[PDB]
Design an enzyme around this catalytic site. Structure first.
Site, short mmCIF file in Angstrom:
data_model
loop_
_atom_site.label_atom_id
_atom_site.label_comp_id
_atom_site.label_asym_id
_atom_site.label_seq_id
_atom_site.Cartn_x
_atom_site.Cartn_y
_atom_site.Cartn_z
N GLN A 40 0.74 -1.16 0.01
CA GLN A 40 -0.14 -0.16 0.07
C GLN A 40 1.00 1.24 -0.09
O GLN A 40 2.18 1.18 0.24
CB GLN A 40 -1.03 0.09 1.48
CG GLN A 40 0.13 -0.05 2.39
CD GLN A 40 -1.01 -0.77 3.63
OE1 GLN A 40 -2.07 -0.77 3.79
NE2 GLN A 40 -0.09 -1.49 4.60
N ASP A 146 0.59 -12.30 7.44
CA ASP A 146 -0.77 -12.09 7.16
C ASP A 146 -1.41 -12.54 8.43
O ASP A 146 -1.16 -13.72 9.16
CB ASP A 146 -1.03 -13.23 6.04
CG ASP A 146 -2.49 -12.91 5.53
OD1 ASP A 146 -3.14 -12.11 5.77
OD2 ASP A 146 -2.81 -13.26 4.26
N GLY A 147 -2.59 -12.03 9.08
CA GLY A 147 -3.21 -12.31 10.19
C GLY A 147 -4.09 -13.85 10.04
O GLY A 147 -4.15 -14.49 10.59
N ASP A 165 -7.70 -4.69 14.60
CA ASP A 165 -7.18 -3.36 14.17
C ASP A 165 -6.88 -3.30 12.86
O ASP A 165 -5.71 -3.26 12.42
CB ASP A 165 -6.12 -2.74 15.06
CG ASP A 165 -6.05 -1.24 15.03
OD1 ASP A 165 -6.78 -0.77 14.13
OD2 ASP A 165 -4.91 -0.99 15.38
N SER A 166 -8.00 -3.60 11.94
CA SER A 166 -7.87 -3.39 10.35
C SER A 166 -7.93 -2.19 9.60
O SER A 166 -8.71 -1.28 10.24
CB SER A 166 -8.45 -4.49 9.84
OG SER A 166 -9.97 -4.09 9.90
#
Lengths: 291, 286
Positions: A40, A146-147, A165-166
């Site tokens: 990002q 990665d969660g 908390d995304s």
């Protein structure tokens, strides 16, 4: 003041199809970092009146001035609803302020955190040093990954609480709002364990929120509740939270067992026992959909 | 023709330095300069029609329900059987429609100094200006400070101050003599509810108003807040005060309200509105 032709220089505007026809803008004093990770677009800036700001893909993730509302509610709504939380997962990183909030709880033994984008952790650690001390607590285990995945390495029934908390559903957090991820959290929680997720604006995202709540009522056979709070620099000035518990000892999210403000960090700036209960009192247009 | 996004309306004020909520504009519907203030109405892309006074958003069709239902139902659901009420400050008549929801009410005085606010609201917001048509309404075009000075002592059950910000015509409505004039006009145990700004932006202003109200009002003095996306910081608050007389518990409505259903207000959110964040509670309850 007549026709909207003259653009005043020096402003960051938060524009997105997730909030069409509107924008929150902050005056920028200085750009501290701007780059583009594997995941990002990453900005840290010094704003004129909200202190330092983290922006990902053009979306405000936090400001110094109001992150206390989000960080204290997302952490203390779950952790103050269960007795002696010991083992907590946080999915999604930032300036570490959520880690500092978890560490207020004296019972906590292990704080696991998973953030996919090491770039965001690195610049956050450097530019928000007074809050990134949260990463230095000896209970904290930071994993870059990665969660969705991390959970698969996760022992069944091992966590007291998972905090999601995304960022928004457009970007790296997309699948964190979908059923398999929630199924994966449920497996990782002990009986009566709790999840608290970032669940968007009741003013802007009722259809999205309806689908989150539906998915949760199907997976989580304990409590399923939706809370909201004031965060000026999130779109529409509010954000919500899914609170769910798995089948097991009963959890009353609306009346906290152990309110953190009642008894190293400063006093809580936002959270207290009364606003914990108040966060579950939704407007009529919402209460009728969500319940 | 200042904005921060070409072609958009941006709400900019020294009362909220360094931030602006912007709305995409489909069409400007009205632009005018009254004797008191600059007046704009525009069709927004996503918030319906928007009334702007001196560059400040006064309402939007999409979220006015949050402000109009809380400013009216917080005070009126807190007192038994209200009959005679005063609204200071004009608009689309949405506040009048919410007061009229109370069957007990017999008389709704409204005083708005600026004829152009009323005319514009009637012309461009006709679906809500039906508020002005309820036969209990007494619309006075006049100075509301003057109107309270000349009000019969003890004659109102409630006063609602639905004002613009302290920069402009509403300046005096935030100062102690206006509040003393309201106390004089209310019966014993009568109540006031005033537009009282953002706890995130205006703590010094709110602290002073609270301090002035505690000096004047010897019944209850409480501050409530609510979500309104298109007010700066996304919240607005209210001063609730009652005069010496019968006790008023603003936090738990003694007079709960049942032509469309309420969109925002309910009994549970009534109590929730008084649960302030720790940083504010400490200042206000000091």
């Amino acid at each position: 003041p007549a026709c909207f032709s003259t653009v005043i220089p020096g402003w960051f505007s938060e524009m997105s199809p997730m909030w069409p026809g509107e924008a929150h803008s902050l005056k920028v004093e200085k750009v501290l970092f701007q780059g583009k990770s594997d995941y990002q677009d990453v900005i840290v800036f010094q704003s004129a009146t909200y202190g330092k700001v983290l922006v990902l893909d053009g979306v405000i993730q936090l400001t110094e001035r109001d992150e206390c509302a989000y960080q204290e509610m997302i952490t203390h709504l779950p952790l103050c609803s269960i007795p002696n939380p010991k083992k907590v997962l946080v999915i999604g990183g930032g300036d570490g302020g959520v880690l500092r909030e978890v560490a207020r709880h004296a019972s906590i033994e292990q704080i696991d955190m998973c953030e996919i984008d090491k770039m965001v952790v690195d610049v956050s650690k450097q530019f928000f040093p007074d809050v990134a001390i949260g990463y230095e607590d000896p209970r904290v285990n930071l994993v870059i990954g990665d969660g969705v995945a991390f959970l698969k390495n996760a022992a069944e029934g091992s966590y007291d609480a998972v905090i999601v908390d995304s960022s928004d559903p457009i970007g790296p957090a997309k699948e964190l709002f979908e059923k398999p991820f929630f199924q994966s959290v449920a497996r990782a929680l002990r009986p009566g364990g709790v999840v608290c997720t970032q669940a968007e604006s009741l003013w802007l995202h009722m259809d999205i929120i309806e689908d989150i709540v539906s998915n949760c009522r199907e997976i989580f056979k304990g409590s399923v509740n939706y809370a909201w709070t004031s965060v000026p620099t999130y779109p529409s000035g509010v954000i919500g939270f899914m609170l769910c518990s798995t089948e097991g000892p009963d959890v009353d999210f609306k009346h906290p067992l152990n309110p953190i403000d009642e008894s190293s960090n400063g006093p809580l700036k936002f959270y207290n026992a009364e606003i914990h209960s108040a966060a579950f009192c939704l407007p009529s247009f919402a209460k009728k959909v969500i319940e």
